[PDB]
Scaffold this active site. Structure first.
Site, PDB file in Angstrom:
ATOM      1  N   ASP A  55     -52.673 -60.078 -84.718  1.00  0.00           N
ATOM      2  CA  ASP A  55     -52.908 -61.346 -84.066  1.00  0.00           C
ATOM      3  C   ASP A  55     -53.044 -62.461 -85.098  1.00  0.00           C
ATOM      4  OD1 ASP A  55     -53.703 -63.483 -82.502  1.00  0.00           O
ATOM      5  OD2 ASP A  55     -55.652 -62.638 -81.957  1.00  0.00           O
ATOM      6  N   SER A  82     -43.547 -78.608 -85.399  1.00  0.00           N
ATOM      7  CA  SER A  82     -42.148 -78.493 -85.026  1.00  0.00           C
ATOM      8  C   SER A  82     -41.541 -79.870 -84.979  1.00  0.00           C
ATOM      9  CB  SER A  82     -42.022 -77.786 -83.673  1.00  0.00           C
ATOM     10  OG  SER A  82     -40.668 -77.749 -83.227  1.00  0.00           O
TER      11      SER A  82
HETATM   12  C1  LIG Z   1     -54.390 -58.462 -75.909  1.00  0.00           C
HETATM   13  C2  LIG Z   1     -54.984 -59.751 -76.381  1.00  0.00           C
HETATM   14  C3  LIG Z   1     -54.748 -60.443 -77.578  1.00  0.00           C
HETATM   15  C4  LIG Z   1     -55.536 -61.555 -77.543  1.00  0.00           C
HETATM   16  C5  LIG Z   1     -55.725 -62.574 -78.612  1.00  0.00           C
HETATM   17  N1  LIG Z   1     -54.949 -63.818 -78.354  1.00  0.00           N
HETATM   18  N2  LIG Z   1     -56.187 -61.510 -76.357  1.00  0.00           N
HETATM   19  C6  LIG Z   1     -57.049 -62.519 -75.762  1.00  0.00           C
HETATM   20  N3  LIG Z   1     -55.873 -60.392 -75.633  1.00  0.00           N
END
Ligand SMILES: Cc1cc(CN)n(C)n1
EC number: 3.4.23.22
Length: 330
Positions: free
Chosen positions: A35, A199
């Site tokens: 993430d 962008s």
């Molecule tokens: C599966 C997942 C990943 C994230 C982070 N944006 N969240 C809120 N849920």
């Protein structure tokens, strides 16, 4: 050093991607959601409230000879969709695709919100935003990338997400076979802790390119592309029957439609998102109303270049002293 790991969509819609991560000694392999929009490495664990675990693979620190409790440390995070998790913290050996970090903070979940419980395919998150967002208290911890970067051949990682297919996260090198043409680099602001960039504009389908600055974040942990309401309205206006539905929570469109592409600018370069990437399928099973992959950021406070955008590109997260982002077509 380098690392290279395959990342795999968790379902037929590419709602998220999971990447296998080795934690502990002997290795416990968990499938984590890499993430670039957050900075905590947290996992379902032997400490997670039993009723909140439903099919996930858990990390058991008591079974790792290299796990150490980080005394007094706790963590608690809330995400943009209202989901959350919290717990305590171990350090342990973490390896991704052959790349090993010792003493990595592994945040053990004691609690997770319902959406994490309900997703049996995601065993945790591995944050790749800047460590200034890390939620561990009282001593903030570094991301896996931040810990690895001195050891890396080059202080970079790359995201090569697949459309309805596996892709790759590389650490420490740029695979020049993985993209076409050249990589266009663009400035990053770290002031909010994100891979935040600007962008240079957009086009809808075969339409003329609109030069306009759109400040947003490159976020592998967000599924969709969230952009200003003006931009999003101009896109969905090209789809017969498309409309914003308050009851569904965004733009929906007839499943019978063929969607136009969406182009975004990176400097003078252009990344084209094929229309099919923007289809997230029936709003409910058997419905002929389909959910759009481009949505308004108006209620969010930030524009988000999520997976819908990133999967159309080979993306370089350059963690040099002055970070930058690179985008190539592929
Ligand atoms: C599966 C997942 C990943 C994230 C982070 N944006 N969240 C809120 N849920």
């Amino acid at each position: 050093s380098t690392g290279s790991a395959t990342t795999t969509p968790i379902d037929s819609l590419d709602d998220a991607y999971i990447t296998p991560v080795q934690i502990g000694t002997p290795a416990q392999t968990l499938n984590l959601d890499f993430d670039t929009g957050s900075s905590d490495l947290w996992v379902f664990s032997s400490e997670t409230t039993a009723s909140e675990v439903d099919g996930q693979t858990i990390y058991t620190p008591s079974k790792s000879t290299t796990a150490k409790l980080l005394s007094g440390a706790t963590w608690s995070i809330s995400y943009g969709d209202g989901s959350s998790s919290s717990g305590d913290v171990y350090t342990d050996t973490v390896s991704v695709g052959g790349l090993t970090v010792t003493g990595q903070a592994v945040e053990s979940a004691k609690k997770v919100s319902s959406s994490f419980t309900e997703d049996s395919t995601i065993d945790g998150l591995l944050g790749l935003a800047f460590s200034t967002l890390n939620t561990v208290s009282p001593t903030q911890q570094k991301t896996f990338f931040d810990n690895a970067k001195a050891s890396l051949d080059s202080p970079v990682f790359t995201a090569d997400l697949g459309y309805h297919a596996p892709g790759t996260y590389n650490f420490g090198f740029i695979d020049t076979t993985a993209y076409t043409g050249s990589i266009t680099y663009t400035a990053v602001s770290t002031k909010q802790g994100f891979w935040e960039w600007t962008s240079t504009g957009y086009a809808v389908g075969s339409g003329t390119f609109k030069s306009t600055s759109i400040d947003g974040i490159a976020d592998t942990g967000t599924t969709l592309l969230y952009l200003p309401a003006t931009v999003v309205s101009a896109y969905w206006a090209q789809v017969s029957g498309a409309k914003s539905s308050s009851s569904v929570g965004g733009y929906v469109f007839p499943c019978s439609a063929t969607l136009p592409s969406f182009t975004f600018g990176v400097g003078s370069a252009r990344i084209v998102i094929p229309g099919d990437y923007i289809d997230f399928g029936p709003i409910s099973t058997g419905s002929s109303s389909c959910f759009g992959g481009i949505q308004s950021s108006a209620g969010i406070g930030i524009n988000i270049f999520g997976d819908v955008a990133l999967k159309a590109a080979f993306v370089v997260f350059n963690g040099a002293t002055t970070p930058t982002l690179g985008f190539a077509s592929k």
